[PDB]
Design a binder for these strands. Structure first.
Ligand SMILES: [Mg+2]
Ligand SMILES: [Mg+2]
Ligand SMILES: [Mg+2]
Ligand SMILES: [Mg+2]
Ligand SMILES: [Mg+2]
Ligand SMILES: [Mg+2]
Ligand SMILES: [Mg+2]
Ligand SMILES: [Mg+2]
Ligand SMILES: [Mg+2]
Ligand SMILES: [Mg+2]
Ligand SMILES: [Mg+2]
Ligand SMILES: [Mg+2]
Ligand SMILES: [Mg+2]
Ligand SMILES: [Mg+2]
Ligand SMILES: [Mg+2]
Ligand SMILES: [Mg+2]
Ligand SMILES: [Mg+2]
Ligand SMILES: [Mg+2]
Ligand SMILES: [Mg+2]
Ligand SMILES: [Mg+2]
Lengths: 153, 262, 206
RNA sequence: CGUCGCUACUACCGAUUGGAUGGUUUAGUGAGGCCCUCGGAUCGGCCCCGCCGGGGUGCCCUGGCGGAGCGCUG
RNA sequence: CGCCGGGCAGCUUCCGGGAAACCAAAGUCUUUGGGUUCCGGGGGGAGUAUGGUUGCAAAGCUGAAACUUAAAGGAAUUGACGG
RNA sequence: UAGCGUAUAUUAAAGUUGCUGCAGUUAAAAAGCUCGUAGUUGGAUCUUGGGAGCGGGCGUCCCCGCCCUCUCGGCGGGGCCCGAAGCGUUUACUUUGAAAAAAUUAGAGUGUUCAAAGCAGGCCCGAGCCGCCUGGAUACCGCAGCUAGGAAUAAUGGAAUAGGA
RNA sequence: UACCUGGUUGAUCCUGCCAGUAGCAUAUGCUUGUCUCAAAGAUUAAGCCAUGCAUGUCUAAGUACGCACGGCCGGUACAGUGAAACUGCGAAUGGCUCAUUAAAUCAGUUAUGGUUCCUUUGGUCGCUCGCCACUUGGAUAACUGUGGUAAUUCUAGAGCUAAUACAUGCCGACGGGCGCUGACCCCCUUCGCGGGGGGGAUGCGUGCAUUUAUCAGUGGUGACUCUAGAUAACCUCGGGCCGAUCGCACGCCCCCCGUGGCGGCGACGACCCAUUCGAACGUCUGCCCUAUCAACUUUCGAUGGUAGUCGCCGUGCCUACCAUGGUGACCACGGGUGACGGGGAAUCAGGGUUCGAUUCCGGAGAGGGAGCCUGAGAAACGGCUACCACAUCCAAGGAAGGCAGCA
RNA sequence: AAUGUAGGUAAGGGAAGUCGGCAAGCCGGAUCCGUAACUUCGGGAUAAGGAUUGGCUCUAAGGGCUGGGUCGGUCGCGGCC
């Protein structure tokens, strides 16, 4: 699909596109430069984020978001929203009186950048805390790992 | 609250102030200044409880208003001025100088110093940024900022600020093997040598320090003030040399003192 | 008054939240500026911390930058032609942060001849003889001609911008926020963005 | 052990489209504040200039009455 | 005539348990923890009232409270009594 | 005993709410029976013993030494050494350290005349002491979050159309 | 101190509850000599309140022509003490109470690289080339005088007078530099052309802050669309800064001369930055009872996307256009609470069970709602406006209220 | 003119008229909400109740037909591979 599906022109604000097409610029074909950054904390930016064409202002690598605070992880539950998914974190809550634990869970809506294309329900996603992206979204998917997959039958 | 608070309850006061319970309901409530109110020593309690020069807040107010209290080379008439860490307190009428340093028990001790040592003061740089016209700047652990420092000075190093000028004479790099002092947390007031620094990106860096006796502890990076080049301090250390000794070897020290005095 | 609180909204689960306090001042909202086009009118509102905000109620000039030519001029805004958010903003000619407008290309043309010495926007010439005759020749020396003829080669303007200059009106996108800063700065649309907005306008009408 | 008969007490059903007091809301009306577009009771400046005046010499340096320029303006 | 496995049981036993009757399970429990489900909290009021739900109906499931009461019960022993 | 009675809420008694730790044939109690999803719980199995000297005394006790790789070793080219990078899973667990307001709790010191308390105080003064010595500790602070050791137990993965190292 | 006893029977072992027993915490009854601490209108009524007080403030260093006093030392702007008043600051803290409030408040943790911040402290304040400066203008207080009303901390008219109030506005640094524009000129390969550079007359902008757009990559983070540079321009008449301020001792230069220029210590002040006090919304985990509450949310924002508006800022906070999502037996949603949360308190083998209105921290509220002005900070109530409920005075025309502050 | 027959209006009250609301009156279409007891579970139901409705100037959304060639390597300014 083409990236211009919105009413406004989708573009990366940092990159200037109209760099004075002149004789010394052999047009065509000049590829548009891509803005990207490493997000720190040892996470490597994916090659799809490096050399894709998608526009996402909330992408951790090609958007205006900084990853700071808590780095945690979850399991993909549903992928029904636009550019964002819901994940389930499973934890054990300790009840002192019975010296036993209690299986609990919480659902978190996290933003999924288009640089992660092969994301399926059940995968393990490492997410990082960012500024509030929506009413219920405060985390970005920084890493995706398959759940006993890496092959299709 | 609809605005800032300007009262401090007596029991909610910082523990290291050593204020009792029955004397009042309120605490000094130090004014805003170079140091946070959690780790500052206001002049009212410094001159009323640590030195006993004053019996009341009115008496310490009289002493302050007669302009005898010089802090860092400047006369301060504020009764509740937050003194803070290693600011030189100078009284020229009685002719002594004080350096405000934590003891082994994490409390500000009455440390007396010579005038020639009091003429200088150590500071821990808290940030280094370049401002307009490309002018480097330097903000210390006080609110003190200076322009045009040595470019070799990096973040959380120590600088020697000579008073009455405010300029830099020398500096100590934060390096492994340098004498430091813990300025916060449980190990508050312990003198030792920087032995290791583990750094956690996105979080607090933890530095491991071994003292003279070999008791190795650790603390967060923000709670460290380098005070010497390698092992020789650049200031006068208080009694006990910042060597925290446990209650087991404190009790027999007390007993030996009682035996010697009796 | 108008409140920007989060507690009046339903919970993520859909449950209804009950407020634990009345409306506070710091969570206030103010009526929209709704900047129109006309003689300059700017009101001042005091904001949190005693600082200042400018409600541009009406504006007619704006500082727009070419970008490709790096020429930035204070020109006149004629009207609004497209708005991504609402069509009603175009109809009421409301200047907002991302609406695209028609601006006078006279200063950009003046810079173009004063810098490159090429007829931009002209049809047949010989219509401004006391000025254009000077600005074409200048009877300048060998070195100055060596500067100008060297600058000739990269004096190429896209055909879309050329058509706009012939019409006398460029179309440019605002970048500032009127009603927050009180001004209507922006940048001249050109390139793929220009083609995208041209196609949007033509699909809207015609 | 149960019915029946008498006396207490406690609840239940029950016509009465029962009654009372709270709470939450639809709708209608809607004070007041704030914002926007007008509005202009008044208060000022310049153009004052019916004039005596006037000095570098009818050509005013202006020291006041005065009409009012019946405009430009805040 | 024997052996093995899975059953329905029986006799016997100071294994042990239990208030005992009895039970090789109702044992391996103050020397208390193999996994897990349901479920009781003095007797009545009461499986009642009300609400919900199922049913053609009869009724089934879920299910109180006010109030009342010092016992109601279990197993055994001795006696009395037995159409 | 200058205090004692009564009413009421609550705690212990109550192993009569039972996680520790109750019961369910007959006392009140296991669904008529079976299947069955959530929930809970899940068999065995992958490193053990051989080493040297300090050694819970090889004193055949054993403080204990154990007989990961690769990058400039900061004492473009030395053995005189220790720093830049990753962990040949991810966790739970355990230990350590940091950071965790004070008061209260425990608890160190201190003859408040004793004590509940308080955070004070004590030494000489021969009278000149034109003043000396101190204290205002320490512990705990669940759960969650952070850091560094251990790897038994428990879960979870790696190479099977090899799309493996 | 890891504890039991009486009561079902003719009698016995049990189950089982009833009663006894001990503590603390409210009330109450009786009694009460000393002394040291010490809770105290929370429970019902966050019900209603007379009266009185509870927030005002001046240094040498903003403005004194009050006679209200007073040195005069006597020919003088102002000695000095100073009421009143303007100005500045504070009144947003403290104190009270616990009604609301069930992932809400709150506790621990963490972030603001997503914000603002009075004051204090430290930077910065000749960085800008641009007919009063030996100091500009008007008004108003206090004050005199004339009144109105029954009333109030109500005020009108008239006449004066000041500023660190309110406005206006230079000089100085200042000599220039820099970047574009470049008249022309000179040296040049010289040669018949091109030439490679040097100057430069005349013009236009130069500093910090703001708002855009573009380029390059002095310091810093784990990670900037950071900081600092360079360019093109902006820079809002309800419009940023670039001192028309006040005390204290008083001295230096005198060629030019002879009245001018220099001076120290402060105070006040500032655009901006830092710091301090914070504040605000965020991240993770954690709360009692209830299913005779099992499906909720979503037209009228519910979950997300894009672009905006608004806000101090991030965000459905709101709007437009799209998508159809989001939460639930791991208890959603609804309801109850005689629920403010926590630090903590009672009881005490261990484990627990109850209680925390109450002096510390945090939150909320000021009869019930709601809306605002000022200010850095309030949706303030010992501030205002309106409605409702109570309620005071009244000459009936009006006027004035808020004890969950101390009594 | 009366009285009638058919049709209207009427202040304030609102069935007090009458055997009796007889007669008249009220309501009424459409759109958006929202709808109870009871029930043979189909209904009740247009329940009840409330809001909107003109003119003018626009803005969106909901369709159908055709054609998309890389070319003279060529002659049936055009045709086969
Ligand atoms: Mg089991
Ligand atoms: Mg029972
Ligand atoms: Mg009890
Ligand atoms: Mg029992
Ligand atoms: Mg039974
Ligand atoms: Mg199952
Ligand atoms: Mg196993
Ligand atoms: Mg309550
Ligand atoms: Mg409380
Ligand atoms: Mg409080
Ligand atoms: Mg309030
Ligand atoms: Mg203020
Ligand atoms: Mg209020
Ligand atoms: Mg009528
Ligand atoms: Mg009528
Ligand atoms: Mg009748
Ligand atoms: Mg009648
Ligand atoms: Mg009819
Ligand atoms: Mg009906
Ligand atoms: Mg209409």
């Amino acid at each position: 699909a083409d990236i211009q599906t919105e009413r406004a022109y989708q573009k990366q604000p940092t990159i200037f596109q109209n760099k004075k097409r002149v004789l010394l610029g052999e047009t065509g074909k000049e590829k548009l430069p891509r803005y990207y950054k490493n997000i720190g904390l040892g996470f490597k930016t994916p090659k799809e984020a490096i050399e894709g064409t998608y526009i996402d202002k909330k992408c951790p690598f090609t958007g205006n978001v900084s990853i700071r605070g808590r780095i945690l992880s979850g399991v993909v539950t549903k992928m029904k929203m636009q550019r964002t998914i819901v994940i389930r974190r499973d934890y054990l809550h300790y009840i002192r009186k019975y010296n036993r634990f209690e299986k609990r869970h919480k659902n978190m809506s996290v933003h999924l950048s288009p640089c992660f294309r092969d994301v399926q329900i059940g995968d393990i996603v490492t997410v990082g805390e960012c500024r509030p992206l929506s009413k219920t979204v405060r985390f970005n998917v920084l890493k995706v790992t398959k759940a006993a997959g890496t092959k299709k039958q | 609250a609809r605005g800032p608070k300007k009262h401090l309850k007596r029991v909610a006061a910082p523990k290291h102030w050593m204020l009792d319970k029955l004397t009042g309901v309120f605490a000094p409530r130090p004014s805003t200044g170079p140091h946070k109110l959690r780790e500052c020593l206001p002049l009212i309690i410094f001159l009323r409880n640590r030195l006993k020069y004053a019996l009341t807040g009115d008496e310490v107010k009289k002493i302050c208003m007669q302009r005898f209290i010089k802090i860092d080379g400047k006369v301060r008439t504020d009764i509740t001025y937050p003194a803070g860490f290693m600011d030189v307190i100078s009284i020229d009428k009685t002719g002594e100088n004080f350096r405000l340093i934590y003891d082994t028990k994490g409390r500000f001790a009455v440390h007396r110093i010579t005038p020639e040592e009091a003429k200088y003061k150590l500071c821990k740089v808290r940030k280094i940024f370049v401002g307009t016209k490309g002018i480097p700047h330097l903000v210390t652990h006080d609110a003190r900022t200076i322009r045009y420092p040595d470019p070799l000075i990096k973040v959380n190093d120590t600088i020697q600020i000579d008073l009455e000028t405010g300029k830099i004479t020398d500096f100590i790099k934060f390096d492994t093997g340098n004498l430091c002092m813990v300025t916060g947390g449980a190990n508050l007031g312990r003198i030792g040598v920087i032995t290791n620094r583990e750094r956690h990106p996105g979080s607090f860096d933890v530095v491991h320090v071994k003292d003279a006796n070999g008791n190795s502890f650790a603390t967060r990076l923000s709670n460290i003030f380098v005070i010497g080049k390698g092992n020789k301090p650049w200031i006068s250390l208080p009694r006990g040399k910042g060597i925290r000794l446990t209650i087991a070897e404190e009790r027999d020290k007390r007993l030996a003192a009682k035996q010697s005095s009796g | 008054g108008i409140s920007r609180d989060n507690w009046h909204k339903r919970r993520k689960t859909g449950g209804k939240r009950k407020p634990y306090h009345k409306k506070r001042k710091y969570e206030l909202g103010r009526p929209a500026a709704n900047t129109k086009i006309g003689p300059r009118r700017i009101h001042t509102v005091r904001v949190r911390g005693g600082n200042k905000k400018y409600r541009a109620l009406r504006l007619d000039v704006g500082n727009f930058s070419w970008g490709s030519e790096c020429c930035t001029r204070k020109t006149r805004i004629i009207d609004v032609v497209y708005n991504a958010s609402n069509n009603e903003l175009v109809r009421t000619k409301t200047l907002v942060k991302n609406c695209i407008v028609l601006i006078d290309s006279t200063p950009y043309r003046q810079w173009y001849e004063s810098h490159y010495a090429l007829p931009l926007g002209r049809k047949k010439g010989a219509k401004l003889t006391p000025e254009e005759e000077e600005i074409l020749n200048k009877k300048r020396s060998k070195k100055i001609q060596k500067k100008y003829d060297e600058r000739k080669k990269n004096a190429k303007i896209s055909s879309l911008l050329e058509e706009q200059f012939q019409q006398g009106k460029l179309l440019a996108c605002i970048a500032s926020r009127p009603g927050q800063c009180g001004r209507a700065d922006g940048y001249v649309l050109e390139g793929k963005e220009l083609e995208f907005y041209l196609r949007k306008i033509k699909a809207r009408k015609g």
